[PDB]
Design a protein around this ligand. Structure first.
Ligand SMILES: Nc1ncnc2c1ncn2[C@@H]1O[C@H](COP(=O)(O)OP(=O)(O)OP(=O)(O)O)[C@@H](O)[C@H]1O
Ligand SMILES: O=C(NOC[C@H](O)CO)c1ccc(F)c(F)c1Nc1ccc(I)cc1F
Ligand SMILES: [Mg+2]
Length: 287
């Protein structure tokens, strides 16, 4: 779509991350309601246009598992990324309201994430690079979609508490789409237990549900300690095994997207009848 600053009317604020703010907006010429992300950057015209050009690939993304893109442009010190408005927000904010997300929901999320990453790899040769609950969006039609993947290397460079980065990435060695699987595994543990799971919950913390760690200490924990795991009574063995295969520290032994698609947890989840829309609407108070 052709998009420019004066096309838009602000409706409300959707949220803010470290270096961006997202607004629900009306696109007057089309009538479309969008989510417009504004990334404030101080960069010269050559860099701005390289970011915008790199983002044009997003017009080619078309999947039920990937948030739709309408367009990108630069205005007043900010790159705008206009995308599909997801009325359920992110799984991060869903997690806050829900406390914990149950296994059968997380099964539908797992399927959507695997298929989204498969689509990005197979059709666009893109790894995601930033899988985490805040980058998985949901809506009241019960859809689950990935956003904020690294289509633009220049946007990544111009922008550079919780870390979702795999051991291999944190140690500065080789990484691939396998590092996204790690991020998914960790995201799933977080949502399953209701807390970012590094360091592991002990005895009395698991009891209640069923000092914080500095960034350098956290990173060295991820690289050197055994991977997080689900508690073993409350979740099915298939779910525990699924998460375990995602969180293998050696990326060559960690399951890949093709193996996950065929995992027992995934086969079972795919056959289950889960009214996700109904669950979502009542947990966050939508219509
Ligand atoms: N397309 C969308 N529809 C609805 N809400 C959205 C959409 N895109 C983003 N949001 C909301 O806007 C908020 C800010 O998003 P943003 O990507 O800037 O930050 P983040 O992913 O939460 O954090 P970080 O900066 O740590 O990566 C998110 O919490 C998300 O809930
Ligand atoms: O927005 C991104 N993530 O970071 C969030 C910041 O922390 C804002 O606070 C981001 C980073 C690199 C890149 F290449 C992109 F295309 C990004 N955005 C992005 C990608 C796909 C869709 I569909 C919609 C989008 F917006
Ligand atoms: Mg985000």
């Amino acid at each position: 779509m052709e998009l420019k600053d004066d096309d838009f009317e602000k409706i409300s604020e959707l949220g803010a991350g470290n270096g961006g703010v997202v607004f629900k907006v009306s696109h007057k010429p089309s009538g479309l309601v969008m989510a417009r992300k504004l990334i404030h950057l101080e960069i010269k015209p050559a860099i701005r246009n390289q970011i915008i050009r790199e983002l044009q690939v997003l017009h080619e993304c078309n999947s039920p598992y990937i948030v739709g893109f309408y367009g990108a442009f630069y205005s007043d010190g900010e790159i705008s990324i206009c995308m599909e408005h997801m009325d359920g927000g992110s799984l991060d904010q869903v997690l806050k309201k829900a406390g914990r997300i149950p296994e059968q929901i997380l099964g539908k999320v797992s399927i959507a994430v695997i298929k989204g990453l498969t689509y990005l790899r197979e059709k666009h040769k893109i790894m995601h690079r930033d899988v985490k609950p805040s980058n998985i969006l949901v809506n009241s039609r019960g859809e689950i979609k990935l956003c904020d993947f690294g289509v633009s290397g220049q946007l990544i460079d111009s922008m550079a508490t919780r870390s979702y980065m795999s051991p291999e990435r944190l140690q500065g060695t080789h990484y691939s789409v396998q590092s996204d699987i790690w991020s998914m595994g960790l995201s799933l543990v977080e949502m399953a237990v209701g807390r970012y799971p590094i360091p592991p919950p002990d005895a009395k913390e698991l009891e209640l549900m069923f000092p914080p760690m500095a960034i350098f200490e956290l990173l060295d924990y991820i690289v050197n300690e055994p991977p997080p795991k689900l508690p073993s009574g409350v979740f099915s063995l298939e779910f525990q095994d699924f998460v375990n295969k995602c969180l293998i520290k050696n990326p060559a032994e960690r399951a890949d997207l093709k193996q996950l698609m065929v995992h027992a947890f995934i086969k079972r989840s795919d056959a289950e009848e889960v009214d996700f829309a109904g669950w979502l609407c009542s947990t966050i108070g939508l219509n």
